[PDB]
Amino acid sequence: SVMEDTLLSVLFETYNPKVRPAQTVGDKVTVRVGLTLTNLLILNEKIEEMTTNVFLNLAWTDYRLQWDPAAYEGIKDLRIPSSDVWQPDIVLMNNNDGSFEITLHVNVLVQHTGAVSWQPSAIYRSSCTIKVMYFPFDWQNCTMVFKSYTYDTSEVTLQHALDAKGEREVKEIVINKDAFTENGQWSIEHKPSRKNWRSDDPSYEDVTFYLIIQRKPLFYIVYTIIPCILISILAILVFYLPPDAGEKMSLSISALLAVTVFLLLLADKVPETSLSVPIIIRYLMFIMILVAFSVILSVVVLNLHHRSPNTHTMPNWIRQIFIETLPPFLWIQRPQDLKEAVEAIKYIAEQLESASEFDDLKKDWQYVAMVADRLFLYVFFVICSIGTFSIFLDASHNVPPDNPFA
Amino acid sequence: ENEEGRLIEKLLGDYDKRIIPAKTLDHIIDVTLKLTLTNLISLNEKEEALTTNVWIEIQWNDYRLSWNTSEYEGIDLVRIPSELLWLPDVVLENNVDGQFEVAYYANVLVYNDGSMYWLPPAIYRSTCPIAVTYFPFDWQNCSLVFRSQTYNAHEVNLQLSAEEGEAVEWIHIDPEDFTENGEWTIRHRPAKKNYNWQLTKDDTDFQEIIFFLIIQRKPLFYIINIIAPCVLISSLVVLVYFLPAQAGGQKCTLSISVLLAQTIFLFLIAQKVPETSLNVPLIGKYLIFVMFVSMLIVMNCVIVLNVSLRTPNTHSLSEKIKHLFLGFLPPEIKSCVEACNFIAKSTKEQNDSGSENENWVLIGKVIDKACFWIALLLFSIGTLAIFLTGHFNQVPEFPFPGDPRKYVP
Amino acid sequence: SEHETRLVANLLENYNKVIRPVEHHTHFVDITVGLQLIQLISVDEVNQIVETNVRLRQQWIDVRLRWNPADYGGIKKIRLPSDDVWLPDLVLYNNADGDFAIVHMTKLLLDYTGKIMWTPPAIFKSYCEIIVTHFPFDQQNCTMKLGIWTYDGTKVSISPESDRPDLSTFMESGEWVMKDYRGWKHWVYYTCCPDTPYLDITYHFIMQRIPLYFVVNVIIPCLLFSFLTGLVFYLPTDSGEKMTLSISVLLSLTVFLLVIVELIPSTSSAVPLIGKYMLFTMIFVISSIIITVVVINTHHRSPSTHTMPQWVRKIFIDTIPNVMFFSTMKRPDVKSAIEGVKYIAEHMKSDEESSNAAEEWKYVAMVIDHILLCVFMLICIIGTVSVFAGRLIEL
Amino acid sequence: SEHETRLVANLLENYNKVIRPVEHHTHFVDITVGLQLIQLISVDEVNQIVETNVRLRQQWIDVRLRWNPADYGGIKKIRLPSDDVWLPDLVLYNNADGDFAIVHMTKLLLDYTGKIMWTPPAIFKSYCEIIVTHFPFDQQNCTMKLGIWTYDGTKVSISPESDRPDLSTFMESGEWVMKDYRGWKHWVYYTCCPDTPYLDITYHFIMQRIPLYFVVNVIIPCLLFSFLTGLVFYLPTDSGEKMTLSISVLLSLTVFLLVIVELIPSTSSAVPLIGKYMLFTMIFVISSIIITVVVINTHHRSPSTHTMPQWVRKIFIDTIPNVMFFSTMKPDVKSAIEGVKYIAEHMKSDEESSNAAEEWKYVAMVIDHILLCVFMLICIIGTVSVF
Amino acid sequence: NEEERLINDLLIVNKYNKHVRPVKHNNEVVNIALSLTLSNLISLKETDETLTSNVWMDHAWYDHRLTWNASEYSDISILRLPPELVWIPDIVLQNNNDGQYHVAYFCNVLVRPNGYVTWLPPAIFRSSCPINVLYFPFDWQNCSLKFTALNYDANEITMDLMTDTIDGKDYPIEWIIIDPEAFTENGEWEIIHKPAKKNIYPDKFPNGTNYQDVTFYLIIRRKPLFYVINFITPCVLISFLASLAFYLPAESGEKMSTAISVLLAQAVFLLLTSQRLPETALAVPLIGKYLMFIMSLVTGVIVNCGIVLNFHFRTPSTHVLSTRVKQIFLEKLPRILHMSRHDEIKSGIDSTNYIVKQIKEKNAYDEEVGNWNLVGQTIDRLSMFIITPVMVLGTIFIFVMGNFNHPPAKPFEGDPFDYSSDHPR
Numbered sequence A: 001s002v003m004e005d006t007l008l009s010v011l012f013e014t015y016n017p018k019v020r021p022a023q024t025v026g027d028k029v030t031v032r033v034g035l036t037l038t039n040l041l042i043l044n045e046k047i048e049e050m051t052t053n054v055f056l057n058l059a060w061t062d063y064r065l066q067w068d069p070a071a072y073e074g075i076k077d078l079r080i081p082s083s084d085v086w087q088p089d090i091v092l093m094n095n096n097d098g099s100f101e102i103t104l105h106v107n108v109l110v111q112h113t114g115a116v117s118w119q120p121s122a123i124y125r126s127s128c129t130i131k132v133m134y135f136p137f138d139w140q141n142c143t144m145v146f147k148s149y150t151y152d153t154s155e156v157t158l159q160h161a162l163d164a165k166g167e168r169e170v171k172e173i174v175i176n177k178d179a180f181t182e183n184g185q186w187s188i189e190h191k192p193s194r195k196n197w198r199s200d201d202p203s204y205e206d207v208t209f210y211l212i213i214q215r216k217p218l219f220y221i222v223y224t225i226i227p228c229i230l231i232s233i234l235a236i237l238v239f240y241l242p243p244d245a246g247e248k249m250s251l252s253i254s255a256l257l258a259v260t261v262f263l264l265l266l267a268d269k270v271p272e273t274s275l276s277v278p279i280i281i282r283y284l285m286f287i288m289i290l291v292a293f294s295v296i297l298s299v300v301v302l303n304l305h306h307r308s309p310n311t312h313t314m315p316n317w318i319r320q321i322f323i324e325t326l327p328p329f330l331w332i333q334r335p336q337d338l339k340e341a342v343e344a345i346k347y348i349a350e351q352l353e354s355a356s357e358f359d360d361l362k363k364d365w366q367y368v369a370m371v372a373d374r375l376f377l378y379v380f381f382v383i384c385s386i387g388t389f390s391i392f393l394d395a396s397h398n399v400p401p402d403n404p405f406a
Numbered sequence B: 001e002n003e004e005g006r007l008i009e010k011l012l013g014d015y016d017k018r019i020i021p022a023k024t025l026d027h028i029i030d031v032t033l034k035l036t037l038t039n040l041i042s043l044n045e046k047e048e049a050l051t052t053n054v055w056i057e058i059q060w061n062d063y064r065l066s067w068n069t070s071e072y073e074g075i076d077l078v079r080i081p082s083e084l085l086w087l088p089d090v091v092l093e094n095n096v097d098g099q100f101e102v103a104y105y106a107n108v109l110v111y112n113d114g115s116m117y118w119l120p121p122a123i124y125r126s127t128c129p130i131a132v133t134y135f136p137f138d139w140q141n142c143s144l145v146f147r148s149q150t151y152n153a154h155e156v157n158l159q160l161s162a163e164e165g166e167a168v169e170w171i172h173i174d175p176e177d178f179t180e181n182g183e184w185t186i187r188h189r190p191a192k193k194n195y196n197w198q199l200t201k202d203d204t205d206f207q208e209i210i211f212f213l214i215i216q217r218k219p220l221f222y223i224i225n226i227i228a229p230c231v232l233i234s235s236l237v238v239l240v241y242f243l244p245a246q247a248g249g250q251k252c253t254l255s256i257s258v259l260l261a262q263t264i265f266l267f268l269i270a271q272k273v274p275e276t277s278l279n280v281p282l283i284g285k286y287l288i289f290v291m292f293v294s295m296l297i298v299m300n301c302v303i304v305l306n307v308s309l310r311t312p313n314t315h316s317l318s319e320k321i322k323h324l325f326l327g328f329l330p331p332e333i334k335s336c337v338e339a340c341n342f343i344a345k346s347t348k349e350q351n352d353s354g355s356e357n358e359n360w361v362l363i364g365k366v367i368d369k370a371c372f373w374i375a376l377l378l379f380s381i382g383t384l385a386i387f388l389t390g391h392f393n394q395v396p397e398f399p400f401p402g403d404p405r406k407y408v409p
Numbered sequence C: 001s002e003h004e005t006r007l008v009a010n011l012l013e014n015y016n017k018v019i020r021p022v023e024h025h026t027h028f029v030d031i032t033v034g035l036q037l038i039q040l041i042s043v044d045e046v047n048q049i050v051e052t053n054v055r056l057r058q059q060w061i062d063v064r065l066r067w068n069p070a071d072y073g074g075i076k077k078i079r080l081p082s083d084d085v086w087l088p089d090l091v092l093y094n095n096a097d098g099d100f101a102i103v104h105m106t107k108l109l110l111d112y113t114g115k116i117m118w119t120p121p122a123i124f125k126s127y128c129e130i131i132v133t134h135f136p137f138d139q140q141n142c143t144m145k146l147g148i149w150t151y152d153g154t155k156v157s158i159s160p161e162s163d164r165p166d167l168s169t170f171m172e173s174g175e176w177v178m179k180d181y182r183g184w185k186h187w188v189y190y191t192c193c194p195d196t197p198y199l200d201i202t203y204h205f206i207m208q209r210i211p212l213y214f215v216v217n218v219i220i221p222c223l224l225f226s227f228l229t230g231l232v233f234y235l236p237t238d239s240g241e242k243m244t245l246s247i248s249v250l251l252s253l254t255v256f257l258l259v260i261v262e263l264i265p266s267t268s269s270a271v272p273l274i275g276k277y278m279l280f281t282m283i284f285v286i287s288s289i290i291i292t293v294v295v296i297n298t299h300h301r302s303p304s305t306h307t308m309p310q311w312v313r314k315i316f317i318d319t320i321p322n323v324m325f326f327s328t329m330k331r332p333d334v335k336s337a338i339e340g341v342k343y344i345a346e347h348m349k350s351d352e353e354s355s356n357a358a359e360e361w362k363y364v365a366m367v368i369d370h371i372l373l374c375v376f377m378l379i380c381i382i383g384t385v386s387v388f389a390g391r392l393i394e395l
Numbered sequence D: 001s002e003h004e005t006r007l008v009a010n011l012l013e014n015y016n017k018v019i020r021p022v023e024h025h026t027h028f029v030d031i032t033v034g035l036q037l038i039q040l041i042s043v044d045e046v047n048q049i050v051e052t053n054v055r056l057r058q059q060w061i062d063v064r065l066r067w068n069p070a071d072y073g074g075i076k077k078i079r080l081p082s083d084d085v086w087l088p089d090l091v092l093y094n095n096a097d098g099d100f101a102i103v104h105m106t107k108l109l110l111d112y113t114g115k116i117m118w119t120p121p122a123i124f125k126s127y128c129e130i131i132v133t134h135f136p137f138d139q140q141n142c143t144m145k146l147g148i149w150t151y152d153g154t155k156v157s158i159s160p161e162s163d164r165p166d167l168s169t170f171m172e173s174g175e176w177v178m179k180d181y182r183g184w185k186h187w188v189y190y191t192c193c194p195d196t197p198y199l200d201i202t203y204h205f206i207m208q209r210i211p212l213y214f215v216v217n218v219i220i221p222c223l224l225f226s227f228l229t230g231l232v233f234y235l236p237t238d239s240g241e242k243m244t245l246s247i248s249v250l251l252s253l254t255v256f257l258l259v260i261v262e263l264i265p266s267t268s269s270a271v272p273l274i275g276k277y278m279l280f281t282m283i284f285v286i287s288s289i290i291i292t293v294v295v296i297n298t299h300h301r302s303p304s305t306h307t308m309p310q311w312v313r314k315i316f317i318d319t320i321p322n323v324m325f326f327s328t329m330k331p332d333v334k335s336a337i338e339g340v341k342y343i344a345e346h347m348k349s350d351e352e353s354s355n356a357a358e359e360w361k362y363v364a365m366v367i368d369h370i371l372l373c374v375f376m377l378i379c380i381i382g383t384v385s386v387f
Numbered sequence E: 001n002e003e004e005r006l007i008n009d010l011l012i013v014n015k016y017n018k019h020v021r022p023v024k025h026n027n028e029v030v031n032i033a034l035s036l037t038l039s040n041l042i043s044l045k046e047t048d049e050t051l052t053s054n055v056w057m058d059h060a061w062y063d064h065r066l067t068w069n070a071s072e073y074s075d076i077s078i079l080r081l082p083p084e085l086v087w088i089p090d091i092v093l094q095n096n097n098d099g100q101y102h103v104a105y106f107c108n109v110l111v112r113p114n115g116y117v118t119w120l121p122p123a124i125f126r127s128s129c130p131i132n133v134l135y136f137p138f139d140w141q142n143c144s145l146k147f148t149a150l151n152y153d154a155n156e157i158t159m160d161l162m163t164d165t166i167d168g169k170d171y172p173i174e175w176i177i178i179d180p181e182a183f184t185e186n187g188e189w190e191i192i193h194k195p196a197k198k199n200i201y202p203d204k205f206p207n208g209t210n211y212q213d214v215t216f217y218l219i220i221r222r223k224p225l226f227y228v229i230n231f232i233t234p235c236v237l238i239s240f241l242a243s244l245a246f247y248l249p250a251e252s253g254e255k256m257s258t259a260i261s262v263l264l265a266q267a268v269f270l271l272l273t274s275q276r277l278p279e280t281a282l283a284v285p286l287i288g289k290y291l292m293f294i295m296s297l298v299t300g301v302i303v304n305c306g307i308v309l310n311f312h313f314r315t316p317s318t319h320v321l322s323t324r325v326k327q328i329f330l331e332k333l334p335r336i337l338h339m340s341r342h343d344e345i346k347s348g349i350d351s352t353n354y355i356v357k358q359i360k361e362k363n364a365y366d367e368e369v370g371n372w373n374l375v376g377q378t379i380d381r382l383s384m385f386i387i388t389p390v391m392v393l394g395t396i397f398i399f400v401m402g403n404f405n406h407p408p409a410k411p412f413e414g415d416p417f418d419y420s421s422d423h424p425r
């Protein structure tokens, strides 16, 4: 309207947006800082940054933007482009890229009392230190640090934003149900807000917003853990195969190669920091080492099974342990022509008897192999079950604290 | 008081930066270019782009910005930001992206006679069509084409820089600021002025200054980390000729597995070379050759296994085949008597059958040895020839083969 | 503030930001340059570029921007946009992927004496010569070289705030450790231009890589497969599975070779120890496959065509098996029936002789496998102890 | 030059670059539009985006920028920044991942008669409908739709400069070959603006892919592995390696099919012939594995639990072997007496059982010779048809 | 040219303030008519959960300051002005992924002598679209573009869907406009519904900018022929090989290798499927469920082949064939499963008696071994008859449940309106 144009001409005749509004020298401007989260877009664990779609709710008072509504046809507030007025350089201090400032420069709302409110929108990428120990059953503590890049505590005073009825401070991130998209991989547990100082710097003050988010690990479960469980089952199975089948190496080596491939492909999704090893990688390494020991013991069993008296002599300790003691515990108990023809029959009988004795000794070796293989089966089943259950029970008891501590 | 303040206020007062500083209607501005390479950042093979960190030195004369030093306390040189002055729109034309102009618009040095000296830094990403024939023993011939984006040959005369009368016909490399790439070695770096004779002295594309970078790759990394493992794995095919030709010998296992490893290596090579279709890389040719050889050896293993495991039940051992492959290339008493006679006869027949199987096995072994001697020679000759023609790929002695000049300072 | 509005109006009313802030063109601007490292964003080893988040504190005097505090209500400090005043054109010489100069024109602090402090932020993507020879136990030394672009040392002088860059508010990396950081000023003289020195400040950081991630994710599986390599010699030939084990180890190693070659830059200035050791392990596996093929050939040697040479028999049956103490080695028609029994006995005798010779061949193959197993275990343990000067086993 | 400085000051004195360059508002500006292709940067098949480096030549008459050369020292041409004068708002209608309009505001050549020449560069990332039917021997036809955005045909008119785009300075691609290129002018009515016709010029380039990267990297290994399928039938069952070879071939073929899948868009408009042929090859390989398992089972058939039916004996032993020619197939003494008689009877039984087992093995052998001949026939007809 | 005079009068002489709303009184409201034209659905990246669109934003409002008398000037009935000279409403895409809130190209507005201003800029929008992976690849998605006015509150400007005339009566345009002259049909996604709604949130106030918005929805169905041909068919065939592996005899020595190779191929297919979907935990994809079920069943097949091999290689020297197992696997099950079916003389006598005794014992040993072989054959025949029907029925059930998944033929379940271009309400 014409009256609004007159009011704008009067207000900005000598207004300088470069000057912080201090009615008297030494006055501080009180700036209320709030945050509204519309969408938690990404938490990239590789580069350790969080991408968020936020509204930055800022409010302060500019004494130069005061007028009497009765003298201007009852105009009580104005929408003025944000570049025409002084604003505090409230920026995200811990951004990962070079973007300190907002993206969308919405109009400020100026009331006749001088109160200026500004709710610009931005797509922030802030550095988050990822704690990889319990990945993927982990919760993260990602912070957003807001402060004035220009002014210190001697010039501005950061405070908390007020609620709709401006009577109490909102010490938390505001989430609007009408405009908010759930991530689907992270659930927000806590979203407090706090003002932080530095004991070594009396001119420092910021408002930090904390996002305590917990990962939902179903994807990693389905695509990594159950296949490795099947692989470990095969690694246990290899000790039930008989050595005569000729497929012990095939099974054990295939299991080892499968678990190694799973480790390599999961190495893509895990963070590359070296402060700890994620629980998923530790489980994969445990399974890989177990399958390697399965391969080694399968080779040992195959070697035992294929020995013969012509090559080896059974020592006393092997016979004492594997023939007598273990099987009860493992339930695995087991006319010259006539003269020369007579001589030929003698020779045939002697050959048969010698072959029978040789075969009996070979059977003893094969029984030793069978008993050792059954013992390995029981031992590996116990170790695999206990280790897997212990690792996943440790991972299960990792929840964010009830108190955000901030 | 800084006299530069009033001098610059005088110079830029009544000065239009949109006007080419031609004194008369026929005056042609001579624009001088000099390129200083500080770092050859990378040669991206996949996107065929050369990234360089360079300082381009541009010199011309602006008669408007000339003053009398005696009137300004002996000031003979000032710095004026380049945004305030007329510039020749010298751009890199063969850029992969849309970055024509310089990265940082530095100040222009202005002398009292009107001489202008502009030395802005730039990160240039230029198109370099890559020749893949001798990968990874290849050398590339990359180019940086500079020309004026606005003015034709009737307004601006691009030239190479001259110090001490002798033109600088090369890319300048300052020892004070230069780091070797560690993968590419610069062999030649000539510079020349080129003309597009299909156009006239108009059209703004008639003239240009081209800086060439003939760079040779260091292949030691590629050798050790790709070629040696590939050759080592591919040489394992010839070992199938010493395994027994029976169950548990594992001829086909070894052969097929070597073939699979060669396939993996082909996939690895696919990640290191561009996706152009003008030539096949040398390592790709070697991989195709060795995969074909291993396929042939799989076929030979199948044939030898079929020959060695033949029986009189299924196949008859012809006399000609045996000669060819083993002569040139290498009351109660009656019942008891009848029972004994039958036992002896049956044992004799079984023994004869075993002997025939043994003859088949020997023929298989003879074929196996002959094919081994063929295959070892084939594989060795292929490897030697391919990597020998790789090793004999020299960078040309002269930057331009017709020219006899060396283009070095 | 009305006083500050009047002051800002007076300060810039006839101020030319193109002109250097000196009282005489002969003098030089003294600029104090301090580098503050906030965060080490990344070290791209393949591309040889280091990204850092920094603040570039610059202090100088501008006598055109002084005022009397008593005339302006006692104002002593104001904040001005950096675009309003003269600024140094400080450029990162070794820029590789980012901006040469400062692009975030943040506000600056101006005192009533003309003293200016300006601390703009920057993302420096500088070129970093990566020494991949002790990876992943390597330390890196790469720098950020700063200087005034268009002014020589007689017009603008730069001096470091302190000997070292400020890491008071540095955010810990989790992949690198700051061993040392320092800032050195240099005077460069060119034969072209003897009267004009060129100033330059180089900040360098010593980065020690934390190797746990790469150890666990790469080195341990490689060691596991390398140790499984020598286990083929304990596998009996009668199993018919030696090729499976050996070739599977080889395939796993070629996959890990693919991983390694996609981990490191392709520069040939120095050979990475990890690549060299991987090539050595591949040679190890190839020799193992060759010699186990030889063993398989020896085991299945037919006594009909091959007779055991006397030297082979002596070496592999008379002297070597006694050496291994830890092994469990061993060191009418009635006539026709009569000739039938004759034939059966004779064929059994011939079969016994042939089987004895075949068993001798199998014994020789077994002895060869034991020798190879001992040798290969010893070689593998000595090798795994002596890698990266033992830093692997020390970890 | 002082003359040029005064001329430029005079030309842009009362000039309003918001107004169209027409003497009367009922007239229209005629703009000669020419496209010049500098380089085909890339063709993203998966994302269906073609990125090109072009120069967009535009010509028109601005009667407000006339001058007399005699009054300005004989000056006949000047260079002016594009931002100082009225410009046409040409828009790439099918922009996909780039800019709709020209963003590089280069200087334009202004004649003394008012004629204007402006050739700004651009990187057009246009949308391209990829036809994957004949990949990797496919030719692609995707276009560049350029038209004036806010002005209809009665206010601003565009005409093609030539029938074809200018490829005089075109850099050779190394992946694609320009077969044909032409530019067509259209009169279009949109639902937005149904009263008046909006003009556009569509430039299309017929580019043929060079099939050497994919023949070497994809087709050749696929052929090598598919040829190994027939070797399973020549492999005897006693070797104990038929399943290993056949399964390895199948796994390699499925890996290569999955690699091929990654090189084409996920569109379901058409099925590539390479993908269909790989699927058919896998079906053939799996059928071969089925018959191989049947052959292996037959070869090991115990005569105790299986008796050869007459319909098998009559055909596989008496019919095919005579048909297929190129093969080379076909006191206590009484205890001792009772014992030797028992031994002879056991040899009876063993010989009979072994004879039956050999019959089963012969059946398996003729079966896989039949399959090998079928495979060779398929291979021969396939290599004759392709040639 | 009288356009110059008219524009000078409108913008300069009348002192047009670009930063003031086009209202004669401060308490009035500006009506912004808004509509969307989709020219191309560029992509839908499931991993990034982003929808990229090529759209034309149509704005129409009334500016009383841009009115003129067409007869006072020449007969000028329309005028083109750059958007940086006139007031325009700042309508932003609130649910964008990148930092692109506005349009890409700021084209001229069109003004009529009565002040009707129209603005039709093109844009490339990258919006957030949550992905429902439950029925992948037979899935349909429900993307939306939500447009808000963050520069003025609901008391100052009012957003609306643009109206249209058919026979003199106005109807709102409650859908995304698809112009046949300017639409390209996506090869992978087919548009089923495309409604537009003006949403008011009564829990908020007209004080602020979160009270209203205009949302354009896009219910799109994936065309699954690509994934069916290239992913599901090879996986199903390789899976069926596992059940076929029960038919290999134990003497072959390749049962375990066949089954294990099938499992490895299934794992590869599972990993490649994992590469193509977002890491969300809302649901497991249909193809993922099928792959998990088939890998579990193939592991069962591997275990049962191992058991069969263990039974086949038993001997009297280590195991005893009890009567229970003998009658279970040799009498009942084979019939249930319909399966097929002077001292020299004395020395010689003693030696031949010994030979006969040894041959008899060997024959008995071989008989026991053959019985164990038959037991193994019965076990794996029962295994085949149990597992292959489960495999085929599970495959059919899973891949028929997915194919019986359609968009509900009406968006906004409680709303009977079709929101279709052929029947305005």
Ligand SMILES: *[C@@H]1O[C@H](CO)[C@@H](O)[C@H](O)[C@H]1NC(C)=O
Pocket (backbone or CB within 6 Å): B068, B069, B070, B071
């Ligand atoms: C420059 O200035 C000096 C002294 O002011 C004067 O003598 C001289 O003529 C002027 N011109 C030249 C070209 O030196």
Ligand SMILES: C[N+](C)(C)CCOC(N)=O
Pocket (backbone or CB within 6 Å): D149, D150, D151, D190, D192, D193, D198, E108, E110, E118, E119, E120, E121
């Ligand atoms: C004509 N059309 C639909 C391509 C664009 C409309 O732009 C206008 N006229 O504002």
